[PDB]
Amino acid sequence: PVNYYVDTAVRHVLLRQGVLGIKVKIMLPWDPSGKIGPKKPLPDHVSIVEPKDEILPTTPISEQK
Amino acid sequence: TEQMTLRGTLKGHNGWVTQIATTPQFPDMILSASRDKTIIMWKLTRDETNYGIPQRALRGHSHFVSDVVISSDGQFALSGSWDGTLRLWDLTTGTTTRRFVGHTKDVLSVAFSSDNRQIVSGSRDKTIKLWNTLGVCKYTVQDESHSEWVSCVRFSPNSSNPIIVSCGWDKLVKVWNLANCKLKTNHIGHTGYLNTVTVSPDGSLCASGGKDGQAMLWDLNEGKHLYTLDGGDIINALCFSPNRYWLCAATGPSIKIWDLEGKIIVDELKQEVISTSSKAEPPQCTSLAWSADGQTLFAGYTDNLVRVWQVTI
Structure with a gap:
């Protein structure tokens, strides 16, 4: 997942005394949909995407069509 | 009175019997499917030492054969x-x-x-x-x-x-x-x-x-x-009888053969009662089909066997 869900950059910046190293690492958030850019599953703990429906009211009858 | 005797049992599968059917054109054939990914065509000898032998085995599937x-x-x-x-x-x-x-x-x-x-x-x-x-x-x-x-x-x-x-x-x-x-x-x-x-x-x-x-x-x-x-x-699984108004219902430990006129259970077929524990001590019965004679019926189980029965008066 490190290849998809993060980007990482490095830039050197000078000053009058030596060099300072900057590094920035940022994590991409998309999981529901789109662009689609990074893939929809979650990275580190890969979650079970769970919809819900649950009803019954059934009783016996014949309904002609 | 019309009651049931245990006829015999067939052997020749590595997977659970999914369905069985029989053509009334040849009641001396019988056909079977299974989760060993093959449908087996049998050769029925009526000897009670066995009750049949596989004649040929049709091959070529990459998953189960459900119904036949x-x-x-x-x-x-x-x-x-x-x-x-x-x-x-x-x-x-x-x-x-x-x-x-x-x-x-x-x-x-x-x-x-x-x-x-x-x-x-x-x-x-x-x-x-x-x-x-x-x-x-x-x-x-x-x-x-x-x-x-x-x-x-x-x-x-x-x-x-x-x-x-x-x-x-x-x-x-x-x-x-x-x-x-x-x-x-x-x-x-x-x-x-x-x-x-x-x-x-x-x-x-x-x-x-x-x-x-x-x-x-x-x-x-x-x-x-x-x-x-x-x-x-x-x-x-359910299957009506061809020569009666009965109905034969396949439940887990037993097959329940029902007379319809009047509505009552005739008998309950019990197989071998061998000591095993505890979740399904006998294998569940899953499929069943009558012969066109109406004397004999067959059953599919999950122990890879087809048990035979016969009506006796």
Whole structure:
């Protein structure tokens, strides 16, 4: 997942005394949909995407069509 | 009085028996399917040392063979399989005539018409579909279909009119008439998903069952809910008798053979009672089918055996 869900950059910046190293690492958030850019599953703990429906009211009858 | 004796038991499978059928043209054949991904055609000797030997073994599937049915001539045989395809066999050496291409998921149920020109299929696609014998799609049903998996479809014997049964896991039984492909009716009933349905040889009835394990009776043409019977824990397969008005219900530890006129249980078939514990001490019975003689019936179990019985007076 490190290849998809993060980007990482490095830039050197000078000053009058030596060099300072900057590094920035940022994590991409998309999981529901789109662009689609990074893939929809979650990275580190890969979650079970769970919809819900649950009803019954059934009783016996014949309904002609 | 008409009662049952344990006839014998067949052997020759590595996978659970899924279905059995028999052609009345040759009652000396019998056909079987299984989760060893092969359908076995038998050679029945009536010796009680055995009760039959496998003649040939038809091969070529990459997943289970769910249901199987014979031709009306007994010279062809057809299969429905969880690899999403069907095959049309030539039951003389092997050599498939045709394989039917097009489903995205399993083909659970399948049946073969009386005129040998219409072949249907139930799928986990949530589509009933019709198939020419040339192996192309006459029609596809995707409107007013089940909202869950299609459990079993049937061709109905009738005076001449086209009627086909359909039942799914959405706890409904839909009857369809061809050449408009409409809902003839919707029957509501049974708590829990439907496993099976079967039609009377006369054809005016639909004996249905499922997870509920209750046997409700419906009228094909009247469209009325006759009654309900307590059929035990679960009923996976049903089959009317050809020469009686009985109904034979396949429950886990036993098969319950019911006389219909009057409504009562004749006997309960018990197999070997060998000591085992605890979740399914005997194997569940899952399929069953009568012979055309009506003396003998057969059963499918999950121990890879087909147990035989015979009626004795």
